[model samples]
Target: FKPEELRQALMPTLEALYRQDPESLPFRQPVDPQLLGIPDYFDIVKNPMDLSTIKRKLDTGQYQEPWQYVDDVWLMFNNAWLYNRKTSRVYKFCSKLAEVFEQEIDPVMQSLG
Candidate 1:
């Protein structure tokens, strides 16, 4: 229930997700479809999110519960899945990050429960 403890538990999960992509290109910040010239990106992928936004929210007490934070992490990947093809590297990165998140958050979630 305490924000302090929750934030502490969640930070490492973000770190593990970041480690999955060493270059940190796709997941690091918000996607810039205009610059990349993907004009149709906004048509799909309605709710865009990123790891940095997740971290900022966690740090700034925007999350009231652990699951809220978890949901945002999932949203980040879901957006990527909605936009990219399954064979693409960014899609693969999303899958890898999703697995890493589940692994890292397992024990923390149990402890919170």
Candidate 2:
């Protein structure tokens, strides 16, 4: 999918998650230390090799596969931490956010299929 298509597909969910206003629900507040624990994935986008890898993957028919891989990885990681003392609230919020977005995204994915 095109970058803009992906953005359009996800922007509603993202805006709902992050928008700060009376109607905005705070989903998945990152702990200061938890935020610091992860390396910046955006930085990977800036690397030429990483960009090329993604381009090649997309061109080689691995695009959706890798996309799903990362989504699964993230979901699994959240599941593992959801009941833990430090992350339960955030995890619950994230799980709900995932459910909402899945409802939105599933149709688009089905169309692709």
Candidate 3:
């Protein structure tokens, strides 16, 4: 898939959500609420969608490439609906990506169109 146009590359990323595990990783909850410290649960990061899942793998603090990009787009997609709805990690993951979709292509989605 061509990286220049993210739309095509993003299609399967959205379509493939049907295959994800329903058991998602937990959100990052700050361990030290009052005082700043090593925050968030580093545990339960088995899901690639989890920030804990990514950072744990890369001690150097790097990311997992297009997958990370994919995650961001997904997050945008969620916020679009999270305004009044709730979703799991898989849905939240695609939340951001949809914005690029909403912005760039203005894709003819039945709901938005």
Candidate 4:
């Protein structure tokens, strides 16, 4: 299928996926809380608009491309969240553990000129 056709087909799927609770989605099952340091990250990230409340105000079930930008926004946010969370955990672990291991190694003798 052409790019536009692919988009047309996938748009509905994306909408359906977006509308459904990401917590119940099978695709999101493998997300590790240890890796992300945030539980239910996908659900939290996707449902920020409060769909139930907004649906009552707007009768239209359609979202324009610009409004559909949440997918990209969430992608960027998720990546950053993962990076920050992982880096923080690793840094904390290294900082604490380095003290324990550093004492065991002898310091090299200083060179005298």
Candidate 5:
């Protein structure tokens, strides 16, 4: 989506999530590290546009068994958001990503945040 559309979907969405008191955000306070199905937000972003970082982490042999391929994919997706704030209205493929922008993003934040 265009950045404005992306921002429109995101900024207000994020703001509403932040407005929710974290104590009531459905997340367990003493969060176990090996969880993603539960609500946790680590608004991290950066990319090799590759599965490199996730593999790197796995290869380190420092992780518990919970880490997996899908987890890696989602991490990369989350990281791709870093550039969302790059410009005021920089453009992108709108319809192609609109479903993801609408579904996975804000709703995920609302429910998961």
Candidate 6:
């Protein structure tokens, strides 16, 4: 499949995942250190990513390969897990999101291969 076809195949998972935490207002957009009052966020999170950016890039066909999309989502959650302690709610959210993505995207990836 072409890049656009891959984007279409992955769109449902992305949309569904965003809707999962729509009301909580977490993991939707890029993190703002000032807004969240996390003074050293930028220092720790060198490669920040969010669902909104993924949606934008996917919609615009910026991702040339399916792995790029998967990597970004992984990076997004991995960064969250790295920054937040295990006891923190944010870290739990990160774990949940990662598992959900892994589970939901598996069939799509398998079908592609």
Predicted candidate 4 versus true structure: per-residue lDDT over 1-113, tens digit per residue: 23343344334433343343422132222345558576766655543322232232232434343224334323433443443455564334323333332332212101100
User: Relative to the true structure, how large is the alpha-carbon lDDT of every model?
Assistant: 0.84, 0.41, 0.36, 0.35, 0.34, 0.84
Which ranking of candidates, highest lDDT first?
A: 1, 6, 2, 3, 4, 5
Q: Cα deviation in Å at residue 108, candidate 6?
A: 0.6
Candidate 5 per-residue lDDT over residues 24-97, each given as its tens digit? 13211222224734233333323322233433444454334332433543444343344334332211222223
TM-score for each prediction? 0.91, 0.42, 0.23, 0.24, 0.26, 0.91
How good is model 4 by TM-score? 0.24
CA shift at 101, candidate 3, in angstroms? 2.7
Alpha-carbon deviation at 37 in model 3, angstroms: 28
* Candidate 1 C-alpha lDDT tens digits along 52-84: 998898788888889998899889878888889
List candidate 5 segments past 4 Å from native.
Answer: 1-50, 85-113
Give the clash total for candidate 1.
0
lDDT of 2 by residue, 19-57 (tens): 433212332232233364535433432221222232334
Compare the candidates by lDDT and give the number of the best one. 1
Q: Score candidate 1 by TM-score against the native.
A: 0.91
lDDT of 6 by residue, 1-113 (tens): 58689777999888767867732257898899999999899999999999899999898888888888899988988898889998988888777777778888999888777
Worst 10 residues of 6 by lDDT: 16-25
**Model 6: residues with Cα > 4 Å off, grouped in runs:** 22-24
lDDT winner, 2 or 3? 2
Number of clashing pairs per prediction, in order: 0, 0, 15, 0, 1, 0
